[PDB]
């Protein structure tokens, strides 16, 4: 089947810059809308970014709009979320999921409250 | 084969009133024909005519011709 | 002494015989091939889906029985001795049984498509087979007085006129003219006129071609049968003594009967092109077997999708937004991301349902004809059923299935949710 694997983490104080690398294992993810969501220890889930099959669609959160940067790449079937200017609020276990909501036609436009199905084990970003 | 479009060679439109018994030389039953039974009477003038078979004067003319048509008998 | 002398046809027959033999071979060549491909297309690796398919095969079977007699008749023309008195009648039997059956099913095509469009009366496959039996029985019992009288007299197989009354060939032509032409042409004309007058104002995206297809059926029927029946009319007028007829006129009328007869035999070669091979579905199917800025018209609005845990149930709903009257079947298709489109549930308006092997026993498809709605109850859902479900609709006569929905997402798994804000 399709299973996701994220391999971006580390321990950096506020101001650092990490790269969240999410690779697809089993299916080339040219066809799914993949997005990032985090969950700090003791808090509820929350999404931070989202990218789709269509070239123009993109989504970011209110508290991270501009600080992060997501981008798709067919090389090794891996999307990337470049975390720049980290804050203590970003201290959370990030997960890489595939959004299966709001498919208007042909492509999965990224959607609010999108159900995720194939997500990895998670990465720890300590800030 | 649809009707009336079959391959018949002889068709009679009207029958003769009467043929004198001394003018006919031969009668041939229709080898092939479309309409009802029709007898072809050949006169001494070598001209063909249609004749109805169910007639009193045609029946005896078929007995006179057939008897005299038998070659050397 | 002079009166009407026998009118000879020896030269007319000698000039017409090669044309008849040629056309017989042409009709036998294309008629057998064209009608085999019809049966092959609707049976080979595929079940009969609609009532139209039943009548198409039965129409091709009647044409087959007709064209398979032509090589027997060709041996008859080349030498009259070849046919005895007992095969002729039997061989003549196959001509009228197949001829009347061909006209019976042609009439049934219009009727079946008449009651479906205007009266919304749909026939399941099971019922179409039953009517085909009735028509075959009706075609035999109505042909009895047409071939049982043909015997071999004076080495020519001919209608035995001596054992019948003089009124018989007149009645036989009148019955054949109105029974085989007037009545069939009146039914298929009235039916296709009523149908064309409804489709032309509907919102179907093939209303144009539907009318053109139905007009061709009527036009081809006329341009192939009318010359024969119009020659019988002037021939019946001749027998009826209403008009005069010289010898020359009977010779022209004889040749016309022979020529127009061979013309009417070509109509059974065109039946595959008039009903079956005019629809795109049969065109695409034959290929896969022969081995080589605004919205438009009616759009299918879908609703009823969503997310549910494994073992739940969902109800997909699909309906036509516009007013279209030529849809005879609808179904559901799905496409998982990165996989091909597969059929999961198809139902016709007649009632015959068709499910996939993996799905049968879990999903239940239902429809509503008055609303042109189709519902799919998806019970006992599995994680493997996660795909985008598309709705499809098929159209009659034109045999098009280019009515698709936008596609709804159905995900069955132990998913995770993350509200983005
Ligand atoms: C669209 C249809 C009519 C196609 C036209 C076919 C033509 C060839 C048909 C239509 C009417 C037919 C004619 C009807 C009447 C007769 C009179 C007869 O003494 C000779 C044959 C003849 C003359 C037929 C010949 C064939 C004919 C002229
Ligand atoms: C599709 C087209 C080619 C069909 C045309 C029909 C043609 C082939 C047939 C139909 C009726 C036939 C005509 C009817 C009767 C006669 C009178 C005869 O003394 C000469 C031949 C002639 C004139 C025939 C010639 C060919 C004919 C006109
Ligand atoms: C002179 C003695 C008789 C002469 C006989 C000449 C040969 C007859 C052959 C006919 C071809 C038959 C073609 C096949 C017809 C069956 C088509 C079919 O598959 O059946 C339809 C189906 O059953 C519907 O539901
Ligand atoms: C061997 C002899 C060769 C002779 C070859 C003759 C072939 C032409 C067919 C004529 C009758 C069938 C006509 C079919 C009528 C359909 C018209 C139709 O559907 O219109 C097309 C549509 O508008 C756009 O696709
Ligand atoms: C001069 C002699 C001329 C002879 C001319 C013969 C014309 C034959 C026409 C019709 C008879 C067929 C009658 C068939 C009746 C079937 C009724 C039936 O099956 O009912 C279906 C029901 O209506 C579901 O809609
Ligand atoms: Zn004498």
Residue numbers in the entry:
A (entry chain D): 1 to 127
B (entry chain B): 1 to 73
C (entry chain A): 17 to 308, 997 to 1125
Give the published text.
Human cytomegalovirus (CMV) has ‘hijacked’ a relatively ligand-specific human GPCR, and repurposed it through evolution to serve as a highly cross-reactive ‘chemokine sink’ as a mechanism to subvert host immunity. US28 binds with high affinity to many CC-type chemokines, in addition to CX3CL1. US28 signals constitutively via the G protein Gq, and cells expressing US28 exhibit constitutive cell migration, which is thought to principally occur through β-arrestin signaling. Single chain fusions of US28 with intracellularly directed nanobodies (Nb7 or Nb11) enable purification of stable, apo-US28 that can be used to stain yeast cells displaying chemokine on their surface, thereby solving the general problem of structural instability of GPCRs purified in apo form.
We determined the crystal structure of the US28 fusion to nanobody in complex with the engineered chemokine CX3CL1.35 to 3.5 Å resolution. Crystallization of the CX3CL1.35 complex by Lipidic Cubic Phase required an additional nanobody, raised by alpaca immunization against apo-US28Nb7. CX3CL1.35 contacts a symmetry-related nanobody B1 raising the question of whether the native conformation of the complex enables lattice contacts or, conversely, whether lattice contacts induce a non-native conformational change in the complex. The chemokine globular body sits atop the receptor in a very similar disposition as wild type CX3CL1, albeit CX3CL1.35 is rotated by 16.8°, contributing to reduced interaction between the chemokine N-loop and US28 ECL2. Unlike the wild-type chemokine, CX3CL1.35 also projects into the major pocket of the receptor toward TM5 and TM6, contacting Asn1895.39, Leu1925.42, Tyr2446.51, Leu2486.55, and Asp2516.58. These residues superficially surround the Trp2416.48 rotamer switch that is implicated in the transition between inactive and active GPCR structures. CX3CL1.35 loses the extensive direct contacts to TM2 and ECL2 evident in the structure of the wild-type chemokine. Indirect contacts between CX3CL1.35 and US28 ECL2 are mediated by the sulfonate moiety of a MES ion from the crystallization buffer. Conversely, CX3CL1.35 distorts TM1, TM6, and TM7 away from the receptor core, resulting in an expanded binding pocket.
